[PDB]
Design a protein around this ligand. Structure first.
Ligand SMILES: Cc1cc2nc3c(=O)[nH]c(=O)nc-3n(C[C@H](O)[C@H](O)[C@H](O)COP(=O)(O)OP(=O)(O)OC[C@H]3O[C@@H](n4cnc5c(N)ncnc54)[C@H](O)[C@@H]3O)c2cc1C
Ligand SMILES: Cc1cc2nc3c(=O)[nH]c(=O)nc-3n(C[C@H](O)[C@H](O)[C@H](O)COP(=O)(O)OP(=O)(O)OC[C@H]3O[C@@H](n4cnc5c(N)ncnc54)[C@H](O)[C@@H]3O)c2cc1C
Lengths: 484, 480
């Protein structure tokens, strides 16, 4: 074999999973047909949960200073995204090229091999390994790994070759974007309803803006080619009366509300993640972000599989955990698409939702969906609010400096038993090779003595104040496998 | 110039007749005109809202009806709800056809001295700023009638609204439902409404041998201004269910659309609007007639106080400012429900989202509040106590009485829960506000509640007479 894992696609999903696999000491090869990274950026940010999953690995610092957007919308209804702890509408002004730039740098630094101008054309799972035919410039070759991951986009070669179904809804509309320098346009970050449709203006840097247009009168073009700048500028003008034709065009692109999901995330030793497993209309943080969550869910599970300590069922929890969460992103984006872009027909449902966001528990629910901070995985019985949820980022007073954080302690990408009493640290000794013990004092941890976290950050087990390792052995064995 | 009465109401529908009752309770001379020779035989509505029950019970109008049964559960655009989440709440009154409502309202109104004149069509209106002249077409030729105020309670196509020049903005119809009342078929009942391939079907009970068949198909769109024929409906019911009702007795055929419009102004000078003349929307449950009844109960005491020369400056102008937004929320919520319930597969993501949101108590209560009329809160000025601007709940008093039993005269009431501070302050207001010394957890921590003649709380005393003179003057006018 050329590597224990081959990843098809060096977008954010593939490069993030490359990072997680190298943290696990899984030898990995990343393939991409593109000779060069895409120069233009589709996403301009990523979600609050995606901020936390970068920060969890110390990747967020590699951007430098990253600022967040406090306010946003759901289906055109304004919302303060600070109403859940750590919540925002997403990272501000981090273009997708910068994001892929950072994740490749981290993956190559950690030993992932990146090979560009390599198109996968055929895959073969025999049930002891996976083989891939790759078209280079030099000719054709055959690479081999224990597991193949398709992170290869909306038209996933791997998904098709694997025979997995991509069911959902058909495009009912398009939006067009033009990137234009020198127009000095007034921003419209959430978009803005106007007679005839909707306009967004997003910043790109001091002298360029992205204009985004939707028109009720348009009109699926039923083309595979982008609209022209002239066409986008005509749309912008009918919508706002503003003329961008004097500007310098930098890019033109488009997207639709085609909303699909892979019926299976895993067939044998073939796995799917990111846009290969789900497409939907992009809204602000939503699109790339769940691909990063997919990769962070998969990596440690695929690695425990390959290292032979995978408990019975662990790699099957990739599908049962991520399929329903990615489906909810698909659903919420479709609901917002109709609320926001459905014209006067849908005004009553916008006014109704506008009324309902007066209730805290409604603002928290909508912010939770969009940020990715509401994710709760099935980790068996127990009713502690923290159980099955993201571990939040908290200052930890311990030995270490004499100060650290909970997120600093996940850089290694290992399981972690935070001990806030020796009982838990003592039962964990079976699992030192897979779980780190951190003794430090941190409120979501209020009446708690210990928290066990899977390597993705999600709480597998707590100890209320008094209990020792009451449930810990069962917990350790479910997610990390047999004691040594 | 001699006037025929202080108020002429155009329309003897439930809105007109409720208004006539309220005006007579305020001793306003009232003529009600209707072009129809008798009340409509066929019943459009088969009930009314939890708040409409209360406003009938508020006047002792629920006694020749007997016992009013309620529906404990309902839906919001398909999504099931328990409507008892609010105290006093329900999906509305069970099995009371509109004909029975109109008979009861006509009874109380003519009893109380309102003059109801049938075969009288209003064809012309002139408001010269001192009164309003109405040209009436009768079988005995034409007459001119004159009043101080004219109220259009004259339905969806208000003669009065157009003659007053008042815009009726809103949405055009996008669909039609068809109904047919059929005796003898003994159909399976479909109370809530039931989605089937190609549309939706209701079958409601009318009595032992009669059932109402309601029909909508995504394929019919819009067609004309005539009703559909019984055959067009029976055909539709077979396309939707396969069942054949063509061997039953046709009793009635009709239809309604999702046309959703609201009068831009509830008042222009000496012309006011109420009920369907002020708002139409697709009828869902007790929604349609119910808001007209709340309109009448908001307006009556206000238009009386204006005519009798004691209105606070601005009192009658609160008819528009209170009722326009509230009736707005009915038009909005019912359109919302029409797109959730009947919007098809493209609306499934929104059905799923609202499915998720209703698991929160406060969104259940919000939706149940909207639909029942129990959420209504009027601007009554400063104060954060939860009762202010809301309906007074029906409570037991102490030999013993009810808060509602005290509202039958349709006057303001000072509910004094031992003190004589409030009742002394109200001495100047005794001609319009009645003092009830009686003891009644919604009133907990209160020594007194002041209530407008419509049942809405204008002021409360925490444990004396602190601002009662301000509240009395605002709602009931200058002291004697
Ligand atoms: C116009 C537009 C605007 C968008 N806006 C947003 C936004 O605002 N926010 C947001 O979160 N998301 C947005 N998205 C979506 C977002 O870009 C995606 O969710 C994200 O790119 C997913 O990354 P991925 O790595 O999963 O897939 P991709 O980034 O598509 O990566 C797939 C990679 O696989 C490679 N590949 C494919 N097939 C093969 C093969 N056979 N052999 C080798 N290599 C192969 C391709 O070269 C490509 O590099 C937008 C998309 C569009 C089109
Ligand atoms: C098929 C159907 C089903 C419905 N189902 C329900 C339901 O289930 N629940 C619900 O709450 N509501 C329902 N509604 C609506 C409900 O019937 C109305 O909201 C209610 O009748 C309005 O009362 P109103 O007094 O405001 O108007 P109307 O009842 O329309 O009364 C208006 C009156 O004015 C008279 N008039 C009009 N113009 C003139 C004129 N120029 N001169 C003299 N008289 C005039 C007419 O004769 C008429 O009697 C339904 C309506 C329809 C059509």
């Amino acid at each position: 074999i050329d590597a224990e894992v081959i990843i098809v696609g060096a977008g954010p999903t593939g490069l993030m999973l490359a990072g997680e696999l190298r943290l696990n000491n899984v030898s990995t090869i990343v393939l991409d047909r593109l000779a060069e990274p895409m120069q233009q950026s589709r996403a301009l940010g990523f979600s609050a949960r995606t901020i936390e999953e970068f920060d969890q690995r110390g990747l967020l610092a590699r951007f430098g200073e990253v600022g967040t957007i406090p306010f946003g919308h759901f289906g055109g209804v304004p919302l303060d995204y600070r109403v859940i702890k750590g919540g925002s509408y997403g990272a501000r002004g981090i273009p997708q090229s910068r994001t892929e730039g950072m994740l490749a740098a981290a993956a190559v630094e950690l030993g992932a091999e990146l090979r560009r101008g390599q198109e996968v054309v055929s895959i073969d799972d025999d049930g002891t390994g996976v083989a891939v035919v790759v078209r280079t410039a030099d000719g054709e070759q055959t690479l081999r790994a224990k597991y193949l991951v398709g992170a290869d986009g909306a038209r996933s070669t791997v998904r098709k070759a694997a025979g997995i179904d991509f069911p959902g809804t058909d495009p009912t509309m398009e939006m067009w974007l033009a990137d234009v320098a020198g127009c000095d346009l007034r921003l419209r970050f959430s978009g803005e309803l106007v007679p005839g449709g909707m306009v967004m203006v997003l910043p790109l840097g001091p002298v360029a803006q992205r204009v985004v247009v939707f028109e009720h009168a348009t009109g699926l073009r039923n083309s595979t080619e982008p609209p022209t700048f002239a066409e986008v500028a005509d749309a912008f003008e009918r919508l706002t009366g503003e003329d961008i034709r004097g500007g310098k065009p930098l890019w033109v692109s488009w997207f639709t509300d085609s909303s699909r999901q892979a019926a299976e995330y895993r067939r044998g030793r073939i796995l799917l993640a990111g846009d290969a497993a789900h497409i939907h209309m992009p809204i602000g943080g939503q699109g790339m972000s769940a691909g990063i969550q997919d990769a962070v869910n998969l990596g440690w599970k695929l690695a425990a599989e390959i290292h032979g300590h995978a408990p019975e069922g662990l790699l099957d929890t990739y599908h049962t955990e991520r399929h329903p969460v990615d489906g909810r992103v698909v659903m919420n984006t479709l609901a917002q698409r109709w609320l926001y872009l459905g014209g006067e027909a849908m005004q009553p449902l916008r006014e109704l939702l506008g009324e309902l966001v007066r209730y805290p528990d409604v603002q928290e629910h909508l912010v939770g969906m969009v940020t990715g901070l509401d994710i709760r995985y099935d980790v068996g019985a127990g009713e502690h609010p923290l159980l099955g949820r993201r571990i939040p980022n908290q200052e930890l007073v311990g030995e270490f400096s004499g100060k650290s954080t909970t997120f600093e302690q996940l850089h290694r990408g290992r399981g972690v038993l935070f001990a806030f009493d020796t009982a838990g640290p003592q039962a964990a000794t079976g699992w030192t090779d897979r779980v780190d013990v951190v003794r430090a004092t941190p409120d979501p941890f209020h009446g708690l003595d210990a928290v066990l976290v899977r390597p993705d950050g999600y709480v597998a087990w707590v100890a209320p104040a008094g209990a020792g390792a009451a449930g810990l052995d069962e917990a350790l064995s479910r997610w990390f496998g047999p004691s040594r």
